[PDB]
Amino acid sequence: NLIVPSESSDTCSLIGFIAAKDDFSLRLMRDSPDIGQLHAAEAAYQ
Amino acid sequence: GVSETLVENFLSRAALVSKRSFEYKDKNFFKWTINTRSFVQLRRKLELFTYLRFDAEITILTTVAVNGLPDLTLQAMFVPTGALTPEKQDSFHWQSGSNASVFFKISDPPARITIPFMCINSAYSVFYDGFAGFEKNGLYGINPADTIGNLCVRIVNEHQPVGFTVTVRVYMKPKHIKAWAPRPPRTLPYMSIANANYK
Amino acid sequence: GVSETLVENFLSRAALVSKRSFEYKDKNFFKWTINTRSFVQLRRKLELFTYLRFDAEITILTTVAVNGLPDLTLQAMFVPTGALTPEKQDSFHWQSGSNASVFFKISDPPARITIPFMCINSAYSVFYDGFAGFEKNGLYGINPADTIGNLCVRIVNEHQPVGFTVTVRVYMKPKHIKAWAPRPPRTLPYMSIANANYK
Amino acid sequence: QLKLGNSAIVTQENYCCAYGEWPNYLPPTQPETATDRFYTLKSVKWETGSTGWWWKLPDALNNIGMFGQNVQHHYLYRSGFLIHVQCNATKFHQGALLVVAIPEHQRGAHNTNTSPGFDDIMKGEEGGTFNHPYVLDDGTSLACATIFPHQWINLRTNNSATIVLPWMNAAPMDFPLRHNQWTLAIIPVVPLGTRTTSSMVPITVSIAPMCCEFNGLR
Amino acid sequence: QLKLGNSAIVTQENYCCAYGEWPNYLPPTQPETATDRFYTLKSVKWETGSTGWWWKLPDALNNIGMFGQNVQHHYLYRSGFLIHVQCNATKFHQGALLVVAIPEHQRGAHNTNTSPGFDDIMKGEEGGTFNHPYVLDDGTSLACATIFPHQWINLRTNNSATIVLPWMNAAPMDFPLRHNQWTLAIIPVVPLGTRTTSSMVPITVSIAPMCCEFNGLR
Amino acid sequence: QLKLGNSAIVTQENYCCAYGEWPNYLPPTQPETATDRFYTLKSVKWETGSTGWWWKLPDALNNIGMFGQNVQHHYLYRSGFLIHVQCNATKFHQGALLVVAIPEHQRGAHNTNTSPGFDDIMKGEEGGTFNHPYVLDDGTSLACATIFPHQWINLRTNNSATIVLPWMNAAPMDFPLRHNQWTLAIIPVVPLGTRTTSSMVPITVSIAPMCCEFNGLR
Amino acid sequence: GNISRYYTHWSGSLEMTFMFCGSFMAAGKLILCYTPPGGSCPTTRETAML
C-alpha cells in the first residue's frame, strides 16, 4: 500500500528512466518517421 | 555495429537540400542560401546537436525538360559570406573570379564541390541563443557566423528559341563531421525555417 | 576443372532478375522487391542450397524507346527493409537521404551498386520451414529476415511532351557466396514465386 | 544402449553426425538432464502401401515432457537432435527406409497455388505422411535426397538408424512455435513385402534433443 | 560550504562537471576575486502548479554586481559558471526538479511564426517561466532533456544541485549583451504536494561565474 | 539487497541463523536457481486489533511457482528457509512484532476435544490468523515463545526481520503435502497505534526456500 | 527511442531506472517485474511473482 503520514500528500509519483547499456548495437540507418509534413521556407531563394 | 552509430557515419549522407525549377527564355536562375534548415528530415538530424563542424560536399544535379533535349552549360557559382549574389542571369557577379564557380553541363556527371568549413567560429551554432543585430530589431536565433554562403546556379548559354524548364537538385553531404553537445530530438513539428516555434 | 565448380564460380553470374517496362507522360515508375524467386533459371540454382550468404551486385540497365531518343536522368533508390517505398514518382521518399539512391543516365554505362549482405541472420534462408506472423494468418515459407529490400527506379526528369516507354533490365550478380546445406535439384515445375508447390 | 537423462533405449542391433557436426552449446539456461532424453514417439504402422512419414523438429516435441514445457514457456531454443529410428523386422521382411533428416523442409501442396497452412505443417507428435514421397512433397527429387544427412534401414542388413543433428540455422536461436529446423523423413523406397501376410513393421522414432538452450521465459 | 570571493554559501546538505569539463582560462583581464562570487538570485515561489523556471546565462547576471559592471563596460566575456540550486523542503514535501543547464537554448514561441523578441528572451535577474515545460519551450522533449548536464533535486533524497558549467561556445569569447550560452532550466517533473497546505518550497539559485575573462573596455 | 535466483528484494533498512545452523545440502536433485528465490507472500493488513498471522512451511509455498510445482510433482523435499519479514511503518507508528519461527507448531483448537482438520492447518498462501495468540494456539505461552528462533520488529527501531531456518526434522526428507516443519508466526505483542487514523502497516513476508532437494518425481 | 528510429536493427541490453518522488516519511513496497517476450502480460500480482 502507500503509507504517508497526515502531513505528507496522499498522492506520490514515480519517474521512470531508460538508458541503453554499453552492449547496445544499432545498424541499417533509415529515416525517422517522427517528423513529417513551413513559413518563410522560400526565403532562402529570395 | 558500434561503427555505424559514428557521427561521421550518422550525418555524412548526401540528402537533398535544395530543389527549385527555374524557367529559361529569381528571374531565370536560382540562388539558394546554404542552410541546413530547408528540409525537415536532415534538419532534425542536425538539430540533435548544438555545435557542428562539417565540410559540405555539394553535388548539383541538373535535369531538363522542354515546355530534343538541348545540351546546355551551367554555372554553379558559390557566393560566400560577404561577397555579393547575382540578381540577374547576366550580371557582373557571375564573371567575378574570386567566387568559386564551377562550369558543368547537363549531359555530364553531376558537378560536385567540397565547400569547406566556413564559420568564423570553431563550429556552426545550430541553435544560437542570441541575437545578430546590435539593436532590438535583430532577429533571434541567427548567428552572424553560421552563414555558409550562397549557391547561385545559372545557365551560361544565351537565349534559345525553345522554352524549357530546368529543375536543379542540390545534394549536400557533410564531411569530417565533428559534433558537440547533443540535444533532445524535436518532437513537435516545425513552424518556420528561421526559428524553433512549436504548435 | 575443379575450380569452375566452386560455388563462387557457380553462382556469381549476372543473371537478369527483373524486367519491367513503365510508361512516362505502379504509376510511371517501378519498384521491384528484391527476391531471387523471380526467374526460374537463377532460382533453381539458388534452391540447390538451403542457406546463402551473398552480396548482390545489382546492375540497372535502362533502355528507352519513343511511343530522337531523349537523354534522361534516372534514380535507382534501394529501399532497404523497414524503410518506406515510394508510391508515386514525385513522392517524398525519393528525397530521403538515408536510402541508397544512385543517379544515372540512359546514355551512361549502366548503374551498378553492390547491395551488401542484409539478412538479420547469418545467411539467407532460401527455404524457410516456418511462419513469419505470430498468428495463424502468417504465410508459410517467408522468413522475416530474408528480405533484401526494394529496388525503386524512377525518372528524375519532369514531364516531357513526348510519350515513351522505358524498359529497365536489372541484373543481379551475387558476390562472396558462402552456401550451406545443399538440396536436391527441383524436378517438378514451379507454381508460384512464394512457395514450393508442385503439380 | 542409448541412455540420455532418465529415458534409456536398450537398442540391440552407427551414428550419422549430420554434416560432420557434433552438437555443442552456444559459445542461456542449459537443461542437461531435464530435456536431454529420448522422447520416443509413437511407432508407425508400416504396411506395404505406406508412402512415408515426416516429423518436423522441434514441432514433434512441442507438446511432450520437459522439452514440451520449455517450448511453451521459454521463447527461443538452441538444441541439436539425436534421432534413433529403429524398424524392428524379422529375417523374413524386406524393405528399405531412407531415414533422411531434411533441414528447412519447406513443403509444398499439390496442384494449388495456396501455401500450406499451419494445420498442414505443424502436426506434432502424430507426425505427417508424404502425399508424394517421390518428390519429397517439395517438388524436388527423392532420388537425390541422399544429399541430406541420412541413413538407410535396409531390413536385409540393419533395423536401425541414428542421425545426430546439429544446430542448423542461420540464426543463433530461433522460434520453436513457428520455425522447424529439421524434418525427420522416413520414406520406404523399397516397400514392405512378404507373401504369407500383408505385414506391418512398426518404425519407432526416438528423438533426443541434444544440448538444449532456452531464453525468454514467459 | 561554498565560499567564492566575498559571497559564501553555508550549504548544509555533489558537483556535476558539465560535459566533464572544469572551467579554465583561455590558453585578457581576469577578475578572480571581484566577480568569482555567488550572485544568489531571488528565490522562486514553487507552488504545486508551477511549470518551471529558466535563467539564461549570463543574461541573469548582466545587471548584478561586479560581473554586471564588467558586462556593461567590457565587450567580450569568457567565463564558466557554477550554479548551486538549493530547494529547501522539509521531510513532508514531495517533488522532483530537473535542474538542467541547457546550452544554446534557442526558445520558440507557441502557435506563431514570429521569432521571440528581445523582451521574451533577455529577462535578467527575474528569470523566466516555461510556458510549455514538457517541450522545453523549443519543441524538443523534456523526457530527453537529461542529455544535457543536469542534476535531480528529488526532495525525498536531496534538496540541492550543483552544476559546474564550462565555457560553452564555438567562439573563444562572445557577447554578454546579445548571446546567452547556457540556460539554467529548473522544471518540476513531479509537482509539489502536501495535503495540509498548498505549500511553497522556494528554490534558491546561486550562480557563481567561474574564471571570468573580459576584453574591450568602454 | 536480498537477491536469490530471479526474485530480488531491495530491502532498505540482521540475520537470525535459526538455532545457529546455516542450511546445507544432505551429505537428490538440487534446484539452485529455479526454487531458491523469494516467494513474496501477500502483505497482511495490520490494524490495531490484529491478533497475529501464521504461515506453515512449506504449506505456504505448495501452490506458488517452481517450488510449488516441485512439491506437487516430487514426493520428498529437503530445504531450509530464509524468511524476510518487513513491516514498513513511518516514524509515527508504534508497535512490536514477535516474528517467531516455530518448529513443529502442532496447533490446538479452542474448547473442543476434536483435533484440527486439514482445512484448519493447511491454509497456504493466504496464511492463518491466531485465534488466541497469547497461548500461540497450542496451549503454550507467548511470553516464552522467544525460546524459538525469533526477531523483534520494534517499529521504533527496525521494520524488518530476517530468519534463516535450517532443515528441522528428525527425518532426512519428509512430506511437503502432509508435514509442515516450521511456522512463521508474526504476533503483534504491542499493538499498532496512532491517534489521527486507525492505521495499517502492511507486513510483507518473503520466504526463500534455501538449498532445495527433492526426490520421487510423479 | 528516437535515435533508434533512425536505425532499423537494434540489439542490446536496455536499463530502466525508476525514481520514487514521494515524501521522506513515505514507505511502501512496489514489485517491478521484467517480463520477457513470448506469452501473456501478468494481470494479477501473483502471476507477476513468477
Residues sharing a CB contact under 8 Å with residue C112, sequence separation 6 or more, in sequence order: C57, C58, C59, C60
Size of interface A-F (CB pairs under 8 A): 15
CA distance E160 to D152: 79
Q: E75: which 3 cell numbers?
A: 565587450
Using alpha carbons, list the distances in angstroms from residue E137 to C185, D77, E87, E132: 65, 49, 23, 5
Q: B135: which 3 cell numbers?
A: 539593436
Residue F153: CATH number of its domain: 2.60.120.20
Interface of B with G (CB under 8 A): 1, 4-5, 10, 45, 48, 184-185
What stretch of H or E contains G8? Answer: strand G7-11
CA distance F183 to D57: 48
Q: Which residues pair with A16 in a beta bridge?
A: G18
Angle at E43 between CA E40 and CA E49, to 5 degrees: 150
CA distance F18 to F161: 12
- Structural domain boundaries, residue D45: 1-218
Contact G10 A26 (CB under 8 A): yes
**Taking Cα atoms as reference points, which of E207, E213, E138 lies closest to residue E174?**
E213
CA distance E94 to G25: 10
Contact E193 A7 (CB under 8 A): no
Q: Which residues pair with D47 in a beta bridge?
A: none
Using alpha carbons, list the distances in angstroms from residue F166 to A31, F16, F101: 60, 11, 11
* Cβ density class D125-158: b for 16+ within 10 Å, e for less: eebbebebbbbbbbbbbbebbebbbbbebebeeb
Contact C80 A28 (CB under 8 A): yes
Q: What is the 3-state secondary structure (H, E, C) of D84-137?
A: EEEECCCCCCEEEEEEEECCCCCCCCECCCCCCCCCCCCCCCCCECCCCHHHCC
Q: Which residues pair with D166 in a beta bridge?
A: none
Contact E152, E98 (CB under 8 A): yes
Q: Is the dihedral of CA D207, D208, D212, D215 positive or negative?
A: positive
Pairing, β D160-165 against β D15-17: parallel
Which resolution in angstroms does this entry have? 3.3
- Identify the closest residue of chain B to G9 by CA–CA distance: B1
- Name the method of structure determination: cryo-EM
Say how far residue E66 (Cα) sits from the centre of its chain: 18
Contact F145, F136 (CB under 8 A): yes
**Taking Cα atoms as reference points, which of E148, D186, B189 lies closest to residue A37?**
B189
* Cβ density class F126-141: b for 16+ within 10 Å, e for less: ebbebeebebbbeeee
Q: C134: which 3 cell numbers?
A: 505470430
CA distance E184 to D20: 66
What stretch of H or E contains F17? Answer: strand F15-17
* C99 touching chain A per CB within 8 A: yes
Q: Please state whether at least 3 CB pairs lie below 8 Å between chains F and A.
A: yes
What stretch of H or E contains C150? Answer: strand C149-155
Q: Which residues pair with E207 in a beta bridge?
A: E39, E83
What stretch of H or E contains F84? Answer: strand F76-87
HSE-CB at F53 with a 13 A cutoff on CA atoms is: 24
* B184 touching chain A per CB within 8 A: no
* Cβ density class E131-155: b for 16+ within 10 Å, e for less: ebbbbbbbbbbbbbbebbbbbbbbb
Q: Please state whether at least 3 CB pairs lie below 8 Å between chains C and E.
A: no
- In a 3-state reduction of DSSP, which class is residue F15? strand
How much is the CA Rg of chain E, to the nearest whole Å? 17
Q: Please state whether at least 3 CB pairs lie below 8 Å between chains D and G.
A: yes
Say how far residue A42 (Cα) sits from the centre of its chain: 31
Contact C33, C194 (CB under 8 A): no
CA distance B90 to B97: 15
Instruction: Mutate one of D26, D56, D98, D104 to test the C interface: name it (highest C CB count within 10 A).
Output: D104
Angle at F184 between CA F179 and CA F185, to 5 degrees: 120
CA distance B37 to E106: 14
Domain count, chain F: 1
* C98 touching chain A per CB within 8 A: yes
Q: Where are the alpha helices (DSSP H) in C93-159?
A: none
Name residue, grid cell 534463516.
Answer: F164
Q: Which residues pair with C49 in a beta bridge?
A: C182
CA distance C99 to C96: 6
Q: Which amino acid is at B89?
A: Q
CA distance G42 to G39: 9
G residues 22-41 closer than 8 Å to D (CB):
35-40
* A12 touching chain F per CB within 8 A: no
Domains and CATH numbers, chain B: 1-199 (2.60.120.20)
Q: Where are the alpha helices (DSSP H) in chain E?
A: 65-73
Q: Which amino acid is at B193?
A: I
Contact A35 B4 (CB under 8 A): no
**Taking Cα atoms as reference points, which of B18, B36, C188, F148 lies closest to residue A42?**
B18
Contact G26 A4 (CB under 8 A): yes
Helix/strand/coil percent split, chain A, to 5: 10, 35, 55
The shortest C-alpha distance from G30 to chain D (Å) reads: 21
* A32 touching chain E per CB within 8 A: no
Pairing, β E150-154 against β B30-33: unpaired
CA distance D161 to D184: 11
Q: Where are the alpha helices (DSSP H) in chain D?
A: 65-73
* G35 touching chain A per CB within 8 A: no
Using alpha carbons, list the distances in angstroms from residue D26 to C3, D29, D216: 34, 11, 16
Whether the ω angle into residue C185 lies within 30 degrees of 0, i.e. cis, is: no
CA distance D161 to D100: 10
In the sheet with C30-33, reading across from the earlier edge strand, the strands are C30-33, C149-155, C73-80, C103-105
F110 phi/psi in degrees, rounded to 5? -95, 130
